[PDB]
């Protein structure tokens, strides 16, 4: 049911998505261990993900959440990194895309920092890095992130020192770093239908000069 529509680098939509990727890179406290060493990306392709059934699943849950939260879906655009991008874009988010051992519970994780999501592209903590070179900082191999539409509803605020159910009365969790004042938030959802993978971004990390 999924088709992928290539966006032109001249299209304003491509440019707004690239800008959100590039502008939300930060330094990581592991010195690049998980995601590699880089300050910016080479964006190779941005594709719009189109799937009527997955979209309608998303908008149906969005209306439910909105009705439970003073008519406010609290919808965001957020990054998601995973070796299972190919299955997500075809079949949607589900429990197999849950990070069972994450800090904010067994759910599906999203990030404001593209570079946080990049740490998960090859597995938890970057796994063993790219398939070809076993390099977590591979500058050659192509990586993929999703830039997703996510319904947060009433989000439980969990300050952090950096499938389950939402905390009662809530629709998501906000993991808000309280020590590193330049790290942006992460969010966790517990129903796959509260996210739609809008864009598939193909990229390489770039070796700093």
Annotated binding-site residues for Zn(2+) read 130, 133, 138, 141
In the complex with Zn ion, the residue whose CB is nearer, 23 or 128, is: 128
Comparison of 7 and 141: residue with beta carbon closer to Zn ion:
141
43, 124, 141, 184: residue in contact with Zn ion (rule CB under 5 A): 141
Task: Select 53 or 133, whichever has its Cβ closest to Zn ion.
Answer: 133
Minimum CB separation of residue 139 from Zn ion in Å reads 8
Q: Is 78 a binder of Zn ion (CB under 5 A)?
A: no
Select 128 or 178, whichever has its Cβ closest to Zn ion.
128
Question: What beta strand segments (E) does the chain contain?
Answer: 3-6, 41-50, 75-80, 108-111, 143-151, 155-160, 172-177, 186-189, 195-205
Identify the residue among 21, 34, 111, 130 touching Zn ion (CB under 5 A): 130
Binds Zn ion by CB under 5 A, chosen from 12, 31, 132, 168? 132
CA 181 from chain centre, in angstroms, equals 20
Number of neighbours of residue 23 by Cβ within 10 angstroms: 10
Alpha helices in 2-84, H assignment, sequence order: 12-23, 52-67
Pairing of strands 186-189, 108-111: antiparallel
Neighbours of 54 (CB within 10 A): 23
Q: How far is the CB of 86 from Zn ion (least distance, A)?
A: 18
> Least distance (Å) from Zn ion to the CB of residue 127?
12
């Amino acid at each position: 049911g999924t088709i992928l529509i290539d966006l032109s680098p001249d299209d304003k939509e491509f440019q707004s998505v690239e800008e959100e990727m590039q502008s939300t890179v930060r330094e990581h406290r592991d010195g690049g261990h998980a995601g590699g060493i880089f300050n910016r990306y080479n964006i190779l392709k941005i594709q719009k993900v189109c799937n009527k059934k997955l979209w309608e699943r998303y908008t149906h849950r969005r209306k439910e959440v909105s009705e439970e939260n003073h008519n406010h879906a609290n919808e965001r655009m957020l990054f998601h990194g995973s070796p299972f991008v190919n299955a997500i874009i075809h079949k949607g988010f589900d429990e197999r895309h849950a990070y069972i051992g994450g800090m904010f519970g067994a759910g599906i994780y999203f990030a404001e920092n593209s570079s946080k999501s990049n740490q998960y592209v090859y597995g938890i903590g970057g796994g063993t890095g790219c398939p070809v070179h076993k390099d977590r900082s591979c500058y050659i191999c192509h990586r993929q992130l999703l830039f997703c539409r996510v319904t947060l509803g009433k989000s439980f605020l969990q300050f952090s020192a950096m499938m389950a159910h939402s905390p009662p009365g809530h629709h998501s969790v906000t993991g808000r770093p309280s020590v590193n004042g330049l790290a942006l938030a992460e969010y966790v959802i517990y129903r796959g239908e509260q996210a739609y993978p809008e864009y598939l971004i193909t990229y390489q990390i770039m070796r700093p000069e």
